[model samples]
Target: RPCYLVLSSHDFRTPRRANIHFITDQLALRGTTRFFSLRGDMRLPLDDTANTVVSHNGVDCYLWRTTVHPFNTRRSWLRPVEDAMFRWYAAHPPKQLLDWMRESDVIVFESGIAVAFIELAKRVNPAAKLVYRASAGLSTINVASYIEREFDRVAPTLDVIALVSPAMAAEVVSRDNVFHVGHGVDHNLDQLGDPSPYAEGIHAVAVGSMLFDPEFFVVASKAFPQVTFHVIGSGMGRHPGYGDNVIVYGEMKHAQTIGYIKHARFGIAPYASEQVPVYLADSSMKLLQYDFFGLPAVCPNAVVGPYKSRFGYTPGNADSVIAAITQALEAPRVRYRQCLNWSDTTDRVLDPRAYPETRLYPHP
Candidate 1:
């Protein structure tokens, strides 16, 4: 069986973290390859019970992750060639990668730091299939040229380069093996959200951390006192201006966060205004999370097309926020659910035959 070398630098508890584990689980289920994560965090524990290595109990997917190598974040720091005193250090990958290139077949990498190893993977095993899955915001390339060049160097050699959105994929218009595999939502969302909220007396709720504007809550709550708001995740609880109507859960785990929002009548995705390209370029999983729960939201800088119907295409201002909330309470009780799931998104990579047109791209 072919073995897959999966590399990621993202945190183990984030939305994208779910994306990596989900892909590996799918590959394992198909008996196509044996995959393990080579993450950047040094403290990751080994789980023999996880799906990649061996199955524990009778679960279809592995509930745990096995982390092999932990990379040095220091290695990613910039070094000024112009200054002799500048510091730069490149990380050393595990011997498994070397052995995989020599023995195994497929390589799937979802990272910015991991790209540095691609040239090495190609040099050692030029015939091995390679896939570069884009993880971060595509607009981030506009923020820095070095990032663009790093991708440019590897683009020509890749068998596949996957991204989150059509707009993001458009950036690599003519690149070989380009595909749009939207952000993955796990099987945990197997059931559609109920038509009603989980608890009573809660009219609206908000998700997101620092990206959510603190001042907006004060404005929204004061405008509509009859509504009670449940705010989950970090920063919101610390916002000094929050009103009595806002219930702060502080920072909850992803599972808990989703649970609280499931009972909400509405989801609010407040952005701090479009001061940056990343702001306007957000295709946040929060929208998907809200949509998954059949909850509607009001976001400032998020793309309106994907979840516009759920949001009812709500606006950013205070009056617009009030109006959107009022309308959501009025009718449209059914929760809006996304049509696609992570399994299908991930399958696009493992089984290109499933999305034939997506597999082949013409140069512009």
Candidate 2:
């Protein structure tokens, strides 16, 4: 059987399903695929169970936790920590990882310290086609400079550089191997057949923790006391001042969160006032799902690009936020029929040359 390997820095069981998770799961549909997520924290117990692999959603997943210092933090002083982690991983890789890399036909990974494994994979499997999936730009995702340095050093050597959004393409568009594969939704999400998780009341749902504004909930909840605000992924407990009507379901499996989204009054992309990457306009999975489920979206004015049925609100403006939510509730919900599926995203990842039409060009 043709084998594929996915090396991700994200845990396989993260509440929200990132592009890496979907791509790995999609690849498994065709053949044998292994997903290895790296976790190196000195706090974690040094145990053999760290190398254990379990079958999850048709793929063998290894959390690959180590007792080495975690270099994924925002602190730049820990830059050299990655070198130590890399050396350690090179010496003691996950169980069967060498064999999987050797047998792999295609190896996919994101733009982070995980790029260090590309050289190792090339040495192990000379025939394997290596792919670098640029899931986010440096500004939004890579806080550690060392991870950025590694990606810059190894990106050109890969067989293909897949971009998850247009914002990532800007930095590497000059490269010949770069192609924009974009993001996709689990089509099964809409057909999960699970009953609505909401009670008998007007409900609006928000997903993700990226630049989430707790004040939006406080403001919107008080403005429309009738609507119950359900939040997922964001650590609402860390911040306070939210209204009683606001419900924070901190983190949930991707499938479980969909029902709340599908049955809600509308969807909220409640990003804070800080400048976010424009790619979020295209890559925000919650916004895409809101459109997919035909629920109107209430978001900050800056991120409302190209998405239909979006009600944009000015950040920090209480009246604007309330008005946007009010508009979303009153507006007609239109399901965006053009959302891509995981299968489509998989095809683009494997053979972007064949799907030139799907390529997303770099935006200014």
Candidate 3:
């Protein structure tokens, strides 16, 4: 049996479930899998102990907390902040992290920060496969140039470069080790008979705070005063002049959020006015969830990637945003298609033979 170790950027205990959570849980069924979530915030203090093991989602997860400086700040003078944090992590290695690295046959990580340890993993276990599971564009997650350098430095040495978005796949398609392992959805959500979390009325739901445009709610709420807009995520309350019809709630458990989505008239992605990563069109979990439940999705024209179910609005345009919402409200509910599950996603990442043709790109 192959032992798998996942160095994840997301904490498993969080209410929202990300790609890392689902992928690692599926991996546990095939063989031994240890998930170490590298968690921290520069604004808050670090954990008293470096490691805390807890059983979650049928897998033993190690919460490896540390101090993480803000890397996405657009300040030229703070360029060294991210590198310094990585250096500190290298110097004070998390507890049992190296042992897990040495024992595992397949080492996978989804964050650019974890890329710092690729060389160390190879030195620890030369025979093991090191997979860089690219879940989102580095630019969307952190400072692009710094993480881009780290990725470029180790791209050649990586055993597999698993990509979640088609746009990202296009960027590295020339690489021999690249594979398009798109995001997976919990098909079981279809069977969920949960009660509606929203009050009696017509409601449109938006989840997550990623590049969220508060104006989306601001405009839509005014355009359709009868339709209530619900926002679920932390820091989403930055909307200053949104209507009384807009209700913003903090983070909820994954299952609780599902209740709102499954019962909603439609869902919205609502990315900010600034350009969002193109891959978000196909790679967004919330958009996928909307499709999974046959709900129409309203998002920026740029992010309406590949999915026919999406309705696009011109970013920063009030009339365009309202028009898109009008179109979604008028459209019929989409018929749900069977989305790729995490089990198959795991195979595509670790098994080179899983995708025959594009699995290997010969260098000219």
Candidate 4:
């Protein structure tokens, strides 16, 4: 089968691969998929470019390596020349791979630099389909603060653009090419059900980085001494006030997260966002993970449309979170939001024929 090339901001073989993992993991794409991890500061000498394919998990993948140097980014005085280098690299991408002539599709999940790769990919294989899957690094597409006009500029250039929220499609001149894919996971991990992970008290857990309500570990632990608040990931140490009852187990293996879900009574997404809309906008994967295990899910606030939850509370209101947990304690447990999985999500992007609005070319 021909290979579908997907570019990344980092390597896929990393321990905690997310962005593309959700899209590619369970997908039965028409062809095999290859991932090209763009690595390094592009600091290597220009001649160091190496585009070679190797077998990875039964798939032919490429580790297309090159150092763009500081120019592609850096200051204004340097960016003009830096920009040219990337532009040239795109046009003259290495000609070393076989049977990988034109990628079936070229999708960009992170960083604005991908659009350059998208451009270069097309220069060699003009028929390659282009997709820009963006999330503003969170939930909503109000991404102007980060990517600025890059996405707006890339919108017209791409065959399609996939966003996490549908409401984002509202402001597009290229509205026809934009569609909401929502958030998804592997969708195949066994639904875990196990006895409690903690022995002494009612335990609740939160997954995700420190960027999320970083204080929730300390706040929730202190407010409810009878209960245990377990914080996962590195950011737990950042909050100095986390009480002894707050168990800070830094990053764990994915299997461990699944294991913890079964042990805990329920899950909470302390997802905090500074931007007014961004906070409300985030579709917490932590919440989705709870659902994956059919655990009652709670959040500090409401997630936008179609993402139903058993509970959400007011920020700065520990009692509200406590109250929400009280309601979740006995709520009928089930995977509330399993209707959308990565397989179906990828299918939509691959064949949006079922959705007229997301079509690249609409029928008159």
Candidate 5:
């Protein structure tokens, strides 16, 4: 049997999906044949799990259907409710997935999936090589309580924990094998020539689901009436009171998203406190995309980690965000380069040659 990389929980349209897809694709490119199993709502064929596997350059790939559920289910009433439940359930893994875990050499858990996988590992494959990856920092989504409840049950079973941000790695102290593995960017982004055309006026772009702050944009519209604030992605249409300054581009394809970011004056990750997943996973690729096109980024102050210096800004204080924007608008030529590349990040996480027989830690 080929080495299997198992992921469970929620839907296929999320940052977790993006992270897993990138890692798996890089592994295949490096000559690692693997199977990716997504145990979630496989509703849309264009979901990240499917797209990532199909778009790979040259490598054998397989997708396994882990589970099937009835179409009728009561989703949470909150905004981006699918993700909230994912986080809650991810803290506890199911027994049915244990059989798959036993046959796999490595298990990659993204956020909630990590919590669940940790619990399952302890009960079934106590000695299995486990790796946890997340894009956020500590205090993300009040996971401390969940971790405290389950960590004792799952922490000892983990071999290595790879976080996208250094600050997040420091918070989850159980795994001594923790490393800061960065997120991946599209190679096409690097092909874009000059970003001079995108630099025009103060046209700030913010992308993502309905979770990106609607109120902030409403207030920002009033504050910066001259600037054009564009929101791309789903859910914003519901807010009719956002004023005329806010332009809702609705949902667009992944390619269109990158194109918009490439040609925008700057990008804003105005993710609020309620959007803990977005805030914790601070090293959002949208920010990276902006940096790739040489566009400055204005992120929340709370998004702390290694990439802080890259496109760090303060969104909590209105004055600070304004100042940051002013600075970015003036110096649009400065691009933030991250130390993380997908090739290195994926190799460190997936390469079996680097893993010990019992533990997934790379030999020092």
Candidate 6:
């Protein structure tokens, strides 16, 4: 049986690769077939702009690269132009994509930008099972409102919607098509055992795009003078008054993060975007890594949700992040055993047989 994957991100570097890349690679390994195609909206100047097919692990995969409107750019005038382009693309999909949809066994949509393709797919191949994998949660009213409108437009045609957390699943379940597939991690990273080395340190680490709030950590460093706060990744443009307690490691590879995760006393996810409520509702892979190494975490309770039950302490606010760190300092061994492994999550995504009742439309 073969499956067709329709990814909806501008670049492959985002979290879409983090969660589903493993699943597709596994399918190739299993003798079950796989195909790759890009949505009409992901066109880039460097892209081949042609349908290139490649074979991996004895499975033939097709890549349909299409020219899309540049929606996410620095140009302010292009915003409205991009919106018009998206609407035109949806109403009139390319002939090549329409042909592929007719034969595709399943179609997977990654993010909000891909929503237009979902609508097109329904028209071209209504019976084809469509899966929308949401990495964020609907926490803020603005995001919640946008997602609600999108879900209403495409939910009935969708076979299953994958969410990172249960709280997010609940919001979309009213349409009666949803799945709570816990996020998967790249197993390529080296895993360290319990009694992490930096457990006693003034070392606390937070890694994310600079677009996320930096003030949260600035405040955290002040609250915990005894702990050293290291912020990794790029986009911190010369902010002063951070003091010596805060260190910036800049950007590092996925594998390098394992070293930081292994040594750090705890990890912090201080997302301040209420409009992107999903950011607050979903579990951060950083938190998962902390759990993998038996390290405790200090995250907002609202965002952490039931994840707090696993291996760490959840603080209600930024002040609580400091308090949780203090508590972990006294009793580190209490939550050491709560760390989870990727093997379990891998099993769920790779073994469709485990979910016998989970059926796909227009069966492969």
TM-score winner between candidates 3 and 4: 3
User: For model 6, how many clashes?
Assistant: 4
Candidate 4 per-residue lDDT, tens place, 19-109, comes to 4655655332546776665533322332233465655454445656654521234355665566566556555556642235365644444
**What stretches of model 6 exceed 4 Å from their correct place?**
13-87, 99-103, 123-127, 137-150, 173-176, 188-200, 222-225, 273-279, 309-321, 331-364
lDDT of 2 by residue, 45-82 (tens): 42444677777788887777666633556555765775
Please provide, for model 3 over 1-364, each residue's C-alpha lDDT reduced to its tens digit, 9 standing for 90 to 100. Answer: 8888888666655545678878887888877788776633521232443476667666666777555632445666766886665556656656578888888999997856677677778888899899888887676776435566777777778888888865786545237777667777775675562777778888999988777888788889888899988898835664777888888898876667888888888899888853677887778888888888888889899878777767899878998898888888877787654577677777887875556643545532
Q: What does candidate 5's lDDT look like per residue over 29-139, in tens digits?
A: 544334334442444554444423432334333343334411212343432444444454454333435555675666666664346446665556656567666644435
Kindly indicate the candidate among 3 and 5 with the higher TM-score: 3
Residue lDDT tens for model 1, 1-364: 5555555553232332345666666665554443433333332343433334333221122222333332232333432331111111123444544665555466776745556567777877787777777665434522233334456767778877776555556556345577766666656753433344345565677766636776667777777677777777646455667778877776665555656566677777766664433423334677677776666666553444544434432234767666666665664545454446677876776545457655446643
Q: Give the Cα lDDT of each candidate.
A: 0.56, 0.77, 0.75, 0.58, 0.55, 0.55
TM-score of every candidate: 0.72, 0.84, 0.84, 0.74, 0.67, 0.69
In terms of lDDT, model 1 sits at 0.56
Clashes of each: 4, 0, 0, 4, 7, 4
Most TM-score-accurate candidate: 3
- Indicate the worst ten consecutive residues by lDDT in candidate 2: 39-48
Candidate 4 stretches with Cα past 4 Å from truth are 27-30, 39-54, 59-65, 69-111, 135-154, 170-172, 193-201, 210-213, 235-240, 276-283, 292-294, 302-307, 310-335, 354-364
Q: Please list all clashing residue pairs in model 3, or write none if there are none.
A: none
Question: lDDT: which candidate is best?
Answer: 2
Tens digits of lDDT, candidate 6, 291-327: 6565666655545555442223233255555666676
Q: Candidate 1, 133: how far from true, in Å? A: 1.7
